[PDB]
């Protein structure tokens, strides 16, 4: 959480990054979303939220894999796919 | 030390060309040299190929192994045509055999 707070604030430092943020936020969210709202969102996150939210997008999900280079040892897709779930769970 | 052509040579060629088609490695896109049994003389010949040939053979072999697993073959339009079949490994292999044979003749004295 703290890492996100520092990142959020560290980023919006100076006219250019803030401008880019105003400009594109309006494109995406439609509004600006003031620091404080982000803060409340972040505050709401606890272990449970991480577990659930992660499970939803990650758990037993088919990934997209891209590889370039000396990739003979890159695991087979089935093998990568089996790493997306845990047999003890 | 030359002149001749023969209707017979064509029959011999026709028999070779016949067997080549019967062998069928050309249905997998392979070329003759791709199918040679890698012994030491051969591994060294593979080793001496220039990048382009070395890489082409790798891709052809992969293409064939992949066909073999699906027990499929290439469209007839893509089979390797006898007589468009390049003896790319031969000269390296012959040379590696010559040098070995030389080593052997030296080991005799």
């Amino acid at each position: 959480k703290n890492l996100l707070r520092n990142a959020l604030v560290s980023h919006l430092d100076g006219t250019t990054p803030v401008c880019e943020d105003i400009g594109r936020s309006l494109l995406t969210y439609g509004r600006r979303i003031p620091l404080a709202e982000w803060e409340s969102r972040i505050a709401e996150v606890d272990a449970r939220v991480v577990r659930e939210v992660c499970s939803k997008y990650f758990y037993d999900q088919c990934p997209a894999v891209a590889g370039f280079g000396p990739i003979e040892q890159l695991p087979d897709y089935n093998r990568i796919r089996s790493g997306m779930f845990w047999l003890r769970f | 030390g030359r002149p001749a052509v023969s209707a017979s040579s064509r029959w011999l060629e026709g028999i070779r060309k016949w067997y080549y088609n019967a062998a069928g490695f050309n249905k997998l896109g392979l070329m003759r040299d791709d199918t040679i049994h890698e012994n030491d003389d051969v591994k060294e010949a593979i080793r001496r190929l220039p990048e382009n040939l070395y890489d082409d053979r790798v891709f052809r072999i992969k293409r064939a192994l992949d066909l073999s697993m699906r027990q499929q073959i290439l469209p007839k339009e893509q089979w390797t045509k006898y007589e468009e079949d390049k003896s790319y490994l031969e000269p390296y292999l012959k040379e590696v055999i010559r040098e070995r044979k030389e080593r052997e003749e030296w080991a005799k004295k």
Binding site: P75, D76, N78, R79, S82 | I15, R16, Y19, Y20, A22, A23, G24, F25, L28, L30, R32, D34, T35, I36, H37, E38, V58, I61, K62, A64, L65, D66, S68, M69
Partner: protein, 377 residues
């Protein structure tokens, strides 16, 4: 956690999980794991049969019937054993054929170990079959044992030695029980050594061309391919056990002991037929047994007779025809080995015997040489 570091799972991982294997190995490659399943099968059922069988001349035939009638489910265990022995040979045959056709024998050590594994299981099955002390068990035991008597100078001290007497009697049934119990454990060790030498290079494939550019992990792929194929081995085994228990089993072993009376037409088990025909062909004591030994011991000469510039027979029309002529010839030997030594049969049996050797020692190697020339190699 990790499969790779633990001194033990590291072996497992390197043998069944991460072992790089050819993307293209065929059904023909399933037999090695089926041979392993066979060995384990024989081991488990074998064992439970040992908890109830007795090795004395008197009660031997009887204890086996005790198993089939009295002991809970002994019949199913007994039939799985018997039919498992046949499957084991079915698998040996395919496995050895696969190696010939595809040039796999070029892995010298692992192929040589295979031959040893072949002789070991044949030794094992022989001792096994004698165990119930039936008519064929006895006479088969008498025939095979006497082969050793052909050996010059020391021939007879040897058979009597292996007998522990003046003929197949008491002493032999007991020792055969013993050797038949230990052999499969010794086989198991040789098989691990077989698998060790094989991993040194990994598997060959249908094309006879290196697959290092297209290796896949043994695990998800061959793990499931092997499972599926085990279930097929099982169906075929059960069909026998559960629908045709006596089909390969000779009716004469259902009659006890007769050292005094040899059955009219004694017939080998099945997997010995072709070799039995070869031994019989030639009307000579020594030469028959020599031909017999050579008929199997020939596998180890195979590698010296490789003549082709290619490994597999996949791109070799001539060799292919001769290969099947070999198979067709073996099938002829099988038919002939199960038939009376008479008119049409002895001549057919002698010509098939020269053909077997003629094609391995001369025909195949000559085909390889002309296939090379045809290709301008």
């Amino acid at each position: 956690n990790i499969r790779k570091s633990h001194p033990l799972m590291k072996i497992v991982n390197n043998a069944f999980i991460d072992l790089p294997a050819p993307s293209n190995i065929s059904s023909w490659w399933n037999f090695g794991s089926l041979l392993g399943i066979c060995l384990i099968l024989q081991i488990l059922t074998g064992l439970f049969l040992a908890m109830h069988y007795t090795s004395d001349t008197t009660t031997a035939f009887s204890s086996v019937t005790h198993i089939c009638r009295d002991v809970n489910y002994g019949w199913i265990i007994r039939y799985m054993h018997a039919n498992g022995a046949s499957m084991f040979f079915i698998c040996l045959y395919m496995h050895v054929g696969r190696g010939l056709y595809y040039g796999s024998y070029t892995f010298l050590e692992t192929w040589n170990i295979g031959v040893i594994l072949l002789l070991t299981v044949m030794a094992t099955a022989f001792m096994g079959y004698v165990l119930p002390w039936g008519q064929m068990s006895f006479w088969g035991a008498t025939v095979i044992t006497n082969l050793l008597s052909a050996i010059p100078y020391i021939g007879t001290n040897l058979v009597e030695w292996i007998w522990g007497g003046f003929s197949v009697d008491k002493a032999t049934l007991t020792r055969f029980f013993a050797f038949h119990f230990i052999l499969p454990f010794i086989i198991m060790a040789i098989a691990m050594v077989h698998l060790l030498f094989l991993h040194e290079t990994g598997s060959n494939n249908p094309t006879g061309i290196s697959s290092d550019v297209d290796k896949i992990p043994f695990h998800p792929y061959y793990t499931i391919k092997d499972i599926l194929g085990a279930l097929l081995l099982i169906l075929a085994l059960m069909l026998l056990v559960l629908f045709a228990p006596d089909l390969l089993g000779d009716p004469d072993n259902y009659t006890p002991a007769n050292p005094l009376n040899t059955p009219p037409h004694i017939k080998p088990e099945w997997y010995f037929l072709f070799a039995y025909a070869i031994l019989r062909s030639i009307p000579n004591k020594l030469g028959g047994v020599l031909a017999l030994a050579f008929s199997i011991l020939i596998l180890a000469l195979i590698p010296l007779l490789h003549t082709s510039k290619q490994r597999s027979m996949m791109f070799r029309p001539l060799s292919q025809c001769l290969f099947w002529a070999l198979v067709a010839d073996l099938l002829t030997l099988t038919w002939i080995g199960g038939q009376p030594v008479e008119h049409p049969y002895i001549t057919i049996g002698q010509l098939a015997s020269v053909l077997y050797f003629l094609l391995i020692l001369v025909l195949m190697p000559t085909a390889g040489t002309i296939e090379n020339k045809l290709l301008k190699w």
